[PDB]
Amino acid sequence: SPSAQELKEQGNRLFVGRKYPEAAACYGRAITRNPLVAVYYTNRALCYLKMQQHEQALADCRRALELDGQSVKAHFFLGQCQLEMESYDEAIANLQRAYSLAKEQRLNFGDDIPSALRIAKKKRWNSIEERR
């Protein structure tokens, strides 16, 4: 009878093992034991992104944001979802919001968020070039 924290830790181990459907299911079990922890949802959202299940990832980002409106990763993963959906202006807005929140929270992700912003703006520009 594992605790919610034990199930999150098992999911994280499976994530290290690149067993993403199994990790996502573990995070679901953690949610069953405590559905009020935003990190369980952003962890699962990242699994769904790795699994190319952007619709399921977006839903988890929304669940996380309801619980933690300041979540950097919820905004970042949401922007990644929107990039795949070709909602470029929304994706850029969420990536800039993740950048702002990470700065406010003194979080260090190297150059990950600016790199994602550059990817998003290039894809937006590429979408313009593909139509003329």
Added chain:
Amino acid sequence: TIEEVD
């Protein structure tokens, strides 16, 4: 760094 689980 950001594409990691917490």
